[PDB]
Amino acid sequence: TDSFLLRFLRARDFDLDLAWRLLKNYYKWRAECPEISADLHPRSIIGLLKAGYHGVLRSRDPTGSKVLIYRIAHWDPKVFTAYDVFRVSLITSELIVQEVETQRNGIKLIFDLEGWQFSHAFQITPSVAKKIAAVLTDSFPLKVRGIHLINEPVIFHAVFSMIKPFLTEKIKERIHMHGNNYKQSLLQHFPDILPLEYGGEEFSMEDICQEWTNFIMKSEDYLSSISESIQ
Amino acid sequence: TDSFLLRFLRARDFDLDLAWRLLKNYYKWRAECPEISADLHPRSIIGLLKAGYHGVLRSRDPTGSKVLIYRIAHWDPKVFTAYDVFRVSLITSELIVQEVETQRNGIKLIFDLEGWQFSHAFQITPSVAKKIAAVLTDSFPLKVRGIHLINEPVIFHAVFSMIKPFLTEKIKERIHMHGNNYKQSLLQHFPDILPLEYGGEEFSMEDICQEWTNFIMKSEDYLSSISESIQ
Amino acid sequence: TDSFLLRFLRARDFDLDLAWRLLKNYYKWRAECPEISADLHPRSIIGLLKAGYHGVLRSRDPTGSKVLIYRIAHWDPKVFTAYDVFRVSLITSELIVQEVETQRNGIKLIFDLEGWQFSHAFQITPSVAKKIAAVLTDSFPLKVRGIHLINEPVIFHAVFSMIKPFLTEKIKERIHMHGNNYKQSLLQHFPDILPLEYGGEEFSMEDICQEWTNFIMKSEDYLSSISESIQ
Amino acid sequence: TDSFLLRFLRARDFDLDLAWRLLKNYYKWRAECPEISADLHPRSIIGLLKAGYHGVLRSRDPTGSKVLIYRIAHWDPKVFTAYDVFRVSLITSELIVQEVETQRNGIKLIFDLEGWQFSHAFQITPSVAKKIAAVLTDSFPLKVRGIHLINEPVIFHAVFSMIKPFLTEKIKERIHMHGNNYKQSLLQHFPDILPLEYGGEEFSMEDICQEWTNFIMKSEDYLSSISESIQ
Ligand SMILES: [Cl-]
Ligand SMILES: [Cl-]
Ligand SMILES: [Cl-]
Ligand SMILES: [Cl-]
Ligand SMILES: [Cl-]
Ligand SMILES: [Cl-]
Ligand SMILES: [Cl-]
Ligand SMILES: [Cl-]
Structure with missing residues (x-):
């Protein structure tokens, strides 16, 4: 089983210095005032998901990248804030x-x-x-x-x-x-x-x-545990 | 009733340093040679107004900005100078x-x-x-x-x-x-x-x-008093 | 009628430098993140007033100081935040x-x-x-x-x-x-x-x-106008 | 499951620099001469526990802190050393x-x-x-x-x-x-x-x-494994 560090290493081509700096920022970036909470449970943004704001393609691009799609028209700014989104x-x-x-x-x-x-x-x-x-x-x-x-x-x-x-x-x-x-x-x-x-x-x-x-x-329990592991 | 300073504060997000510098320039910008007079009575430019050179929309833009419109075709450079305009x-x-x-x-x-x-x-x-x-x-x-x-x-x-x-x-x-x-x-x-x-x-x-x-x-008397308050 | 500056001058014994610095901080102190709003209408804290949290003596102390009294027991932290108080x-x-x-x-x-x-x-x-x-x-x-x-x-x-x-x-x-x-x-x-x-x-x-x-x-209208004059 | 690093991060408010320095000292503090061993099995200090020297409250204090109690009268210095304690x-x-x-x-x-x-x-x-x-x-x-x-x-x-x-x-x-x-x-x-x-x-x-x-x-096996993981 991979360490938590491995995803940071792969993100910086196994440069331990750069991976370490990325790890530092990963833990403090939310803290920048005004902070965004560490809450990652989908209950507060399920309306956004149901509105069809966002989805991930099942197949990768020719270089193996995961492809994400966002549709701004399906975000109602009256109901959801930028922090929700x-x-x-x-x-x-x-x-x-x-x-x-x-x-x-x-x-x-x-x-x-x-x-x-x-x-x-x-x-x-x-x-x-x-x-x-x-x-x-x-x-x-x-x-x-x-x-x-x-x-x-x-x-x-x-x-x-x-x-x-x-x-x-x-x-x-x-x-x-x-x-x-x-x-x-x-x-x-x-x-x-x-x-x-x-x-x-x-x-x-x-x-x-x-x-x-x-x-x-389906992944709501993993999301809760991640939220717990960064606070 | 607002002070005269308040409009300068709001112009610089209540930064007193920046508002102060703006106030300084507001009083000296005309003085740059050749100077433009402090006269603000509409009598010398009423022809420009009648020619349909300039107008202000009654409604604001989505961010609340006042919207001004100028039409250069209605400025006759033979009759009015750049200083008039x-x-x-x-x-x-x-x-x-x-x-x-x-x-x-x-x-x-x-x-x-x-x-x-x-x-x-x-x-x-x-x-x-x-x-x-x-x-x-x-x-x-x-x-x-x-x-x-x-x-x-x-x-x-x-x-x-x-x-x-x-x-x-x-x-x-x-x-x-x-x-x-x-x-x-x-x-x-x-x-x-x-x-x-x-x-x-x-x-x-x-x-x-x-x-x-x-x-x-309609505001000609206020304009005269402003002209008096900057000289 | 006193200027808005006069209260800052009296606060610093008519030292214009010190009064100016106080005026600067007066406009920016709330802005310190996380900010406290400029809202000064009593509607959101009337419960605190009714609970008997705070009052001002009608008579001054021997040096002429206004005397304020706060009672922490009448602040329910479950109902009102520190920002309310x-x-x-x-x-x-x-x-x-x-x-x-x-x-x-x-x-x-x-x-x-x-x-x-x-x-x-x-x-x-x-x-x-x-x-x-x-x-x-x-x-x-x-x-x-x-x-x-x-x-x-x-x-x-x-x-x-x-x-x-x-x-x-x-x-x-x-x-x-x-x-x-x-x-x-x-x-x-x-x-x-x-x-x-x-x-x-x-x-x-x-x-x-x-x-x-x-x-x-009784002073709710003055409080609203003050709130307007600092934003 | 939490990494070993997570307890150090939480100890220093997820400051990776400070958590790292704490981790460094955690591994070397015992080594300071004269060293204290890494042995954490209760067999050598069970007499201290039976003498009622030390216990932990089951409930936390109002801020959620674990509360520990030590009684010096139940430490016999003739039988147990400072290192035992x-x-x-x-x-x-x-x-x-x-x-x-x-x-x-x-x-x-x-x-x-x-x-x-x-x-x-x-x-x-x-x-x-x-x-x-x-x-x-x-x-x-x-x-x-x-x-x-x-x-x-x-x-x-x-x-x-x-x-x-x-x-x-x-x-x-x-x-x-x-x-x-x-x-x-x-x-x-x-x-x-x-x-x-x-x-x-x-x-x-x-x-x-x-x-x-x-x-x-009851935790003697976990204590043995911890002792193994720091030497
Ligand atoms: Cl938030
Ligand atoms: Cl002129
Ligand atoms: Cl455009
Ligand atoms: Cl050309
Ligand atoms: Cl607030
Ligand atoms: Cl030893
Ligand atoms: Cl005490
Ligand atoms: Cl003594």
Whole structure:
């Protein structure tokens, strides 16, 4: 059985110095005021999962990366805060990091920003923005190998401009903005695995979201134990 | 009743150091040779108001910013100087800064540059250009949250290139150039509130200009007292 | 009519440098993370007032100081947080600072710590503790001329030890601990003005608390305007 | 299942640097000449346990701290050395550190120094004294939240004066000396949980000692494995 350290080693190519620094930040990144709680039980965000906000593709990309999909239109900012939504990503991340192949080949993100509103942007404070940059760079044992933004409205770059200065050069050149005509370019990066809504052949986003919702609910006891092991 | 200092505090998030520096510049920015007078009575620029050069939307943008509209085609450079036109903005600014919600949520500018001529550019000397940059950055207690240029002719960037080096990074990334196809992108930033000429639903620019002209004329006694309180 | 600056000048013996620094801290002390809101309306803490937690003596001490009394036993930590309780002191402070004689002769505090529990101490985090020290020293335009602790249980000094290192030498030598046998020594500091419960002759704490509760409720519109003038 | 590192992280509020330094000292503190062995089997100190020298309260204090009681009168210095007695505390400590709530809320100590003799003091050499200070400060993953000395004879401070210079400021202000009249003040710190001998209501020290003796004997195999894992 793997140590807790092994996922941090694999995240930094078995460089013990870098893995150690990542481990340090992993334990303190939440503590940055205002803090986000260590609670990882799905009960407070099950509405988000049911709304079809988020899902994970069952198949990997050509490099073996786990592929995550987020749909901002299914996040109601009146009901769920940025911290609720961030907690969903933390829950997903703690689950997929258990896979060794994900530890080795990292992850890729697809953000459908269609329906992004100013109400969404209101949630993204400078404190939240730098927390976003933290988990994307050096505060969580997952290698972000690519970030793909699709259907981005012009009003979004104000939010991105808040996040950008806290991003490393490595992650910045891994961010792709495809616009409303995303299908061809997105298909190039992710052949055979995309859902129907994004140019895929077989599965729909609804099934993908429901499947991941079930997996999260099913893993609620592991999530509770992880929450216990970081406080 | 608010002190005179409160609008400067709100302009700099109640940082007394920064508010103090802003207050210092507010009193000396006009004095930069060649100086612009402290006269704020509308009698010398009523022709500009009647020509429909400028107006303020009655409703705020999604973030609560006051929205100002300028139309360069309605400025006759043969009749009014750059100082006359600048005085119009000063008059408007001293009026809208009285609103606490504007003090908190700042302003956004829409410049219809359709009909911009070389005769307009002739008025924009280096001295005028840096005065423009001064009030936009750190010489007036109003937070410029966005500048939107529409219908910009290619000959305009020479003027913008004069202004740019005196602009901070903050204000530079808040400037948007939409070109002649501005409607969709402008509507994204300003839903429900734009006039008919710019994709809106109800009000026309003429009514908006006339309404603001009336408010300025109505406020002529307050404007005189402000002019007295800065000299 | 006095400026807003005058209360800060009187707080620092008309030293403009010191008054200015106090004014700076007055605007930023709440902002220290985690922040306490600027809300000063009594609606959220009326239960505390009705419980008889706090009251102000109608007569001043021999040096002209306003005298405040707090009773920790009437604070239910299950119902009200430390921030609720702190807000009560802020509300009282913004009201009594309006009196010029209080601006000149400062205030004195009497804390009846009888009934202090660990549940009370649980509310006093390091962040709260340093906020306490801030308003007591150089973040509010009121001169704390004396702090009198009575009926202090032995378990309280742990809390005081949290506050002490953030206290100046001036305020530390103005703190008095009288124990359970407080009457004689307390009477020396405050002749003729104490309530019946603390060795006084005429008024009871209940009447004093009810009288101050009424004054706070009566001043709810001024409190709202103050809250507006600091945000 | 928790790593071995987790108890050190919880001991230093998940500060990886501080937890690492604590882990370093945990492995080397015994090695300080003259060394104390890593033997943790109760067979060599069962006489001490049977003599009623030491026991652990079944209920926690109001802050969730585990409460330990030592009775110096039940230590015969002719039969057991300081190293034997120290080993008893090590055995107890390695057992109670397994509880997560103890890892989070630390421990508190009650030392009944009634019957302290010069024969006891003879055992406390400078080397022993600094070993005492080591485990109390930064050499064992248990947070000492309070040390309560009761019935201390005047001849004891000579011993305490040997220990004091090696103690941090944090632990020094957590040491309480109650004297022979300890009951009221001790009851304040530890309501509802004290034994009959110290003002409690239900349980006697004899039962408490016997209960902890049984738990130690019952845990003899875990104690052997721990001894194996540090050499
Ligand atoms: Cl939270
Ligand atoms: Cl845009
Ligand atoms: Cl002029
Ligand atoms: Cl060109
Ligand atoms: Cl609050
Ligand atoms: Cl005590
Ligand atoms: Cl030995
Ligand atoms: Cl003596």
